Write an enzyme that holds these catalytic residues in place. Sequence first.
Site, PDB file in Angstrom:
ATOM      1  N   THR A   1       1.345  -8.506  -0.506  1.00  0.00           N
ATOM      2  CA  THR A   1       2.030  -8.933   0.889  1.00  0.00           C
ATOM      3  C   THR A   1       0.917  -9.815   1.334  1.00  0.00           C
ATOM      4  OG1 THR A   1       3.695  -7.333   0.717  1.00  0.00           O
ATOM      5  CG2 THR A   1       3.436  -8.478   2.815  1.00  0.00           C
TER       6      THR A   1
ATOM      7  N   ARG B   1      -9.423   6.855 -19.093  1.00  0.00           N
ATOM      8  CA  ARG B   1      -8.561   6.970 -17.810  1.00  0.00           C
ATOM      9  C   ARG B   1      -7.359   8.053 -18.235  1.00  0.00           C
ATOM     10  NH1 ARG B   1      -5.857   4.952 -15.068  1.00  0.00           N
ATOM     11  NH2 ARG B   1      -6.051   5.640 -12.954  1.00  0.00           N
TER      12      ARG B   1
HETATM   13  O1  LIG Z   1      12.160  -5.769  -2.467  1.00  0.00           O
HETATM   14  C1  LIG Z   1      11.716  -6.786  -2.763  1.00  0.00           C
HETATM   15  N1  LIG Z   1      10.694  -7.142  -1.956  1.00  0.00           N
HETATM   16  C2  LIG Z   1      10.353  -6.648  -0.520  1.00  0.00           C
HETATM   17  C3  LIG Z   1      10.507  -7.888   0.153  1.00  0.00           C
HETATM   18  O2  LIG Z   1      10.087  -7.416   1.523  1.00  0.00           O
HETATM   19  C4  LIG Z   1       8.896  -5.874  -0.858  1.00  0.00           C
HETATM   20  O3  LIG Z   1       7.918  -6.925  -0.702  1.00  0.00           O
HETATM   21  C5  LIG Z   1       9.194  -4.603  -1.668  1.00  0.00           C
HETATM   22  C6  LIG Z   1       8.740  -4.983  -2.874  1.00  0.00           C
HETATM   23  C7  LIG Z   1       8.628  -3.851  -3.845  1.00  0.00           C
HETATM   24  C8  LIG Z   1       9.303  -2.583  -3.728  1.00  0.00           C
HETATM   25  N2  LIG Z   1       9.346  -1.606  -4.718  1.00  0.00           N
HETATM   26  O4  LIG Z   1       8.948  -1.846  -5.733  1.00  0.00           O
HETATM   27  O5  LIG Z   1       9.460  -0.616  -4.036  1.00  0.00           O
HETATM   28  C9  LIG Z   1       9.732  -2.623  -2.393  1.00  0.00           C
HETATM   29  C10 LIG Z   1       9.770  -3.177  -1.473  1.00  0.00           C
HETATM   30  C11 LIG Z   1      11.660  -7.407  -4.182  1.00  0.00           C
HETATM   31 CL1  LIG Z   1      11.711  -6.261  -5.299  1.00  0.00          CL
HETATM   32 CL2  LIG Z   1      13.036  -8.558  -4.123  1.00  0.00          CL
END
Ligand SMILES: O=C(N[C@H](CO)[C@H](O)c1ccc([N+](=O)[O-])cc1)C(Cl)Cl
EC number: 2.3.1.28
Lengths: 213, 213, 213
Positions: free
Chosen positions: C168, C13
Amino acid sequence: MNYTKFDVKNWVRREHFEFYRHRLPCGFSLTSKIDITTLKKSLDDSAYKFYPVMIYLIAQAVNQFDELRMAIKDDELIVWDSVDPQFTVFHQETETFSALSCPYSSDIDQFMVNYLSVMERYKSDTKLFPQGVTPENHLNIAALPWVNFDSFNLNVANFTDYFAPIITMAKYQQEGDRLLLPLSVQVHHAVCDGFHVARFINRLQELCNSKLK
Amino acid sequence: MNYTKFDVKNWVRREHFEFYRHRLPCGFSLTSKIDITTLKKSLDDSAYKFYPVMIYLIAQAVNQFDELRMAIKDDELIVWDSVDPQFTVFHQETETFSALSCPYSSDIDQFMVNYLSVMERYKSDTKLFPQGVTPENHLNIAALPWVNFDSFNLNVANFTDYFAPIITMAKYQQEGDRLLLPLSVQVHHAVCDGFHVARFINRLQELCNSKLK
Amino acid sequence: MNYTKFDVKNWVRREHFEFYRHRLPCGFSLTSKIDITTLKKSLDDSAYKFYPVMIYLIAQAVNQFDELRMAIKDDELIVWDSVDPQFTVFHQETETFSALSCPYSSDIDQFMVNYLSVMERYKSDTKLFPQGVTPENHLNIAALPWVNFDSFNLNVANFTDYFAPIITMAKYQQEGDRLLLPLSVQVHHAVCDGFHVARFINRLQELCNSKLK
Ligand SMILES: O=C(N[C@H](CO)[C@H](O)c1ccc([N+](=O)[O-])cc1)C(Cl)Cl
Ligand SMILES: O=C(N[C@H](CO)[C@H](O)c1ccc([N+](=O)[O-])cc1)C(Cl)Cl
Ligand SMILES: O=C(N[C@H](CO)[C@H](O)c1ccc([N+](=O)[O-])cc1)C(Cl)Cl
Ligand SMILES: [Co+2]
Ligand SMILES: [Co+2]
Ligand SMILES: [Co+2]
Ligand SMILES: [Co+2]
Ligand SMILES: [Co+2]
Ligand SMILES: [Co+2]
């Protein structure tokens, strides 16, 4: 004015707000199925029509929660006292849509008078925004009545500081005993959490399940 | 040539086109379930295989509608006379995919000859694009046969002016009386509305429901 | 160290990796329904609770596959030997969330000791990240227990080189004979294909369906 300057230093989500507005700018969409078995019965026993009712019920739920009425104005976080729905209108002749808005009212009959009147004036107006600029205090409601979908997501190149909720409905459908309406909700993470979205949907479900008047 | 320069000044969606191409650049995805109960019966009574048939039926629906065959060429909006499917091919040995394309034909038997022949020549070719550059007149079709999904969305960092529809299928599944196929459609808002997507899906459903030949 | 420098020149890959990391940067999300009928029975016959079990089972599946534990460190592609779950915690009093993490352990009982202990120490800590910086070797797990959804997608303005899977879960629900849990998986295309995501889900389904200990 028709808004209040929000207290950002004493708010419990102040760290969240800056995190998701500047450090990690993002939003999310979720599509859920709304049980419209009860609402169909109530529409049946009235003269009201489905789209206008859904617009009215969506704007009613939205107007109950501060976090769905947030905006940036003169570089400050405000809460609209109230928001008016901006919804899409299909033109069967051209096969194009326009986006219209009308004042929200708590009285369902007055709302209907507003909707019909605006629907009256711009029925054949094929501009994208017949009325002109979109009011600052708005919510977006769209409809895809020709097909049922399990998910919908808007992929936007640039969404900085646009906090108005984006709601989209698909064609409803019989799933056994229930008439289910797919409803996509798209929000900015700075002002809304998963909780805030669940709350809105749960509240919207309640409203579908209650007397219209 | 194999395309026509589109009349943008006398088109009904000209305001829309500039709005969603430059003022508010965006696209959307929607996943819908396609009823493949009838198609399974027809495949059953033939020697054709599922993936090739779905590619053929997807390209057939796509080739019926102008708005799904749009592109920018020499800074102008063109409509392809016809488009060829570019689909993914899994290599079970390496656990990697390649993307192949073959000429679309209205004759299902000729299409099958094309697919098998290209499938013949590059069966074990693990380059990402075995054939070389991807034809300009294309549609993307992908498949996730190992898992069923209710939604799929491609989050792309940069999508300016790429108007080819992105279609993705998941593993089908028995939902009572029906065999349902999840189908995600991802399009750019400049050239497609919710109507245009619904139309394609409805048309695709029709085709699944009809004689193969 | 707790990671190994990955062999990029002899990897199958490698063309894919550069394609989707730099030429066409993108990721994808898919939401699938996980059958939790068997897991509910096992939880029933134990003292374990649902959220912690799902965190443990998600981290277990993640820790079985290299491609879900990838990262860039000192401008190189590494594979974490092991990753610890970072999950969201709701504060019912403030209506805000925090993100916590605890060491993964293969022993489910030791995992539970870790979770309860960290849950103990920061139960009422309303900072967004109570513990401080998020460990480099992590996976994100979030939960939306108040509403069922068919699809979830995070629209992120900037995702360059962040390869940790985003998982999620929504509120589970009875769909006839089965208790189904909606599970959205969001990954970067550079390190994961549709195959890799299907594999994880299929593996996660297996784990739900097996003895806890
Ligand atoms: O932002 C976070 N979690 C939110 C919760 O609603 C969501 O799951 C999320 C996770 C990762 C993210 N990212 O990496 O861009 C953005 C939102 C964690 Cl990094 Cl604290
Ligand atoms: O573009 C609009 N609506 C479309 C209709 O398909 C869609 O609902 C949408 C809404 C908001 C949006 N945004 O704010 O980025 C993008 C598309 C309105 Cl702003 Cl006119
Ligand atoms: O990248 C490709 N396909 C993948 C396969 O998982 C996916 O379908 C995809 C298609 C188009 C795309 N784009 O145009 O941004 C991104 C990913 C083809 Cl262009 Cl080879
Ligand atoms: Co800032
Ligand atoms: Co009020
Ligand atoms: Co322009
Ligand atoms: Co033709
Ligand atoms: Co490079
Ligand atoms: Co290991």
